[PDB]
Amino acid sequence: RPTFYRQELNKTIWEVPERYQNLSPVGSGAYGSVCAAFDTKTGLRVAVKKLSRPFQSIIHAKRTYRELRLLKHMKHENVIGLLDVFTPARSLEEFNDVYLVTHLMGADLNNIVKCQKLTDDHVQFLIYQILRGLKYIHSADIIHRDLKPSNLAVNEDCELKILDFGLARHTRWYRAPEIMLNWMHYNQTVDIWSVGCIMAELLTGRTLFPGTDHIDQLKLILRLVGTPGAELLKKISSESARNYIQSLTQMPKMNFANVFIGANPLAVDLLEKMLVLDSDKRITAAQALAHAYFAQYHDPDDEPVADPYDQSFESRDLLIDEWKSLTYDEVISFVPPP
Numbered sequence: 268r269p270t271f272y273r274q275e276l277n278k279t280i281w282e283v284p285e286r287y288q289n290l291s292p293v294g295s296g297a298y299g300s301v302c303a304a305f306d307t308k309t310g311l312r313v314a315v316k317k318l319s320r321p322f323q324s325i326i327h328a329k330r331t332y333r334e335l336r337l338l339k340h341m342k343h344e345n346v347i348g349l350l351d352v353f354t355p356a357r358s359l360e361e362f363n364d365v366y367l368v369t370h371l372m373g374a375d376l377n378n379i380v381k382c383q384k385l386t387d388d389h390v391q392f393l394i395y396q397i398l399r400g401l402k403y404i405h406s407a408d409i410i411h412r413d414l415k416p417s418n419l420a421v422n423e424d425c426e427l428k429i430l431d432f433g434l435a436r437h438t439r440w441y442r443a444p445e446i447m448l449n450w451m452h453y454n455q456t457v458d459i460w461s462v463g464c465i466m467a468e469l470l471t472g473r474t475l476f477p478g479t480d481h482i483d484q485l486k487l488i489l490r491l492v493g494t495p496g497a498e499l500l501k502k503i504s505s506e507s508a509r510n511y512i513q514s515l516t517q518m519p520k521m522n523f524a525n526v527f528i529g530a531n532p533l534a535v536d537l538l539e540k541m542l543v544l545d546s547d548k549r550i551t552a553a554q555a556l557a558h559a560y561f562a563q564y565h566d567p568d569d570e571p572v573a574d575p576y577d578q579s580f581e582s583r584d585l586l587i588d589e590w591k592s593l594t595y596d597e598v599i600s601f602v603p604p605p
């Protein structure tokens with residue numbers, strides 16, 4: 268065991284091992300109860316997240332178990348990984364707190380683009396890294412579901428890591444329409460749509476689709492990608508959806524080259540491949556990585572897939588204490604990095 272140390276930041280109290288000094292409440296709890304700290308053992312700066320009421324209900328206990336499992340699985344340069352997970356409980360019996368530790372990233376895209384648009388080479392390198400991380404997560408059947416600029420962490424290096432993946436469900440500005448509009452089905456390409464919206468924002472400096480709500484959002488998307496065609500409506504299982512869609516004013520798809528003027532045309536062609544309404548036609552992360560727009564960074568031999576990930580628990584309906592014990596088991600068997 269290690270020697271812990273109490274303290275109270277904001278209003279919450281924190282009990283971490285002594286190897287973690289200088290805890291300072293980071294990014295307005297936007298990433299949750301996270302503190303920046305110094306790793307006395309690695310001499311590196313890490314981010315410390317104390318889960319909020321980890322086992323108050325079944326649902327919380329399940330989300331806690333889900334989080335730990337996901338973080339323990341992530342072993343990739345472009346996806347946040349687990350440096351350490353600890354609890355101040357000497358027993359499963361008194362296990363009520365969870366703390367997760369990852370590398371500390373400098374900033375997130377929600378702010379850096381808020382300093383005016385980016386250069387094309389900056390977009391190539393950032394979007395490239397997102398696609399590499401996405402290729403890895405999707406290869407394990409994990410979907411981020413809420414890819415957003417504040418969910419993309421970068422260092423001064425422009426080194427990029429995806430965060431907060433696979434938590435959402437089982438903001439709308441970046442959401443794929445097959446999620447907005449009722450639920451005409453979907454897949455992992457729901458993340459590609461988000462990357463499309465993000466890339467667009469980075470290139471222009473403006474929110475591609477600044478929706479006011481679900482209906483205003485959809486309306487903004489169709490204006491750009493156009494009204495759903497016959498091949499698309501043929502695949503819509505939702506009678507509800509087929510009504511709305513087939514009833515609103517028919518809009519043609521616009522010329523991206525005209526909407527994104529002066530942008531690297533290679534970039535425009537890629538945006539065309541990501542921003543398609545039909546989720547079966549959207550480009551994949553793996554395919555996108557081979558897009559000429561990334562000629563300068565692409566390397567098939569260094570774009571790894573992930574080991575398989577056991578998501579069967581997702582289907583289980585257990586008691587709070589059973590999720591707790593499972594979480595406890597996961598904390599216990601944790602094996603740090605190299």
Ligand SMILES: CC[C@@H](C)Nc1ncc(C(=O)Nc2cc(C(=O)NC)ccc2C)s1
Pocket residue numbers: 293294298301314315316334337338347367368369370371372373374375419420421429430431432434
């Ligand atoms: C980019 C924002 C700036 C302020 N720095 C940051 N570095 C790292 C941050 C972070 O959230 N780490 C983190 C992410 C997850 C996660 O992704 N769970 C699925 C879980 C726990 C932690 C501790 S935030």
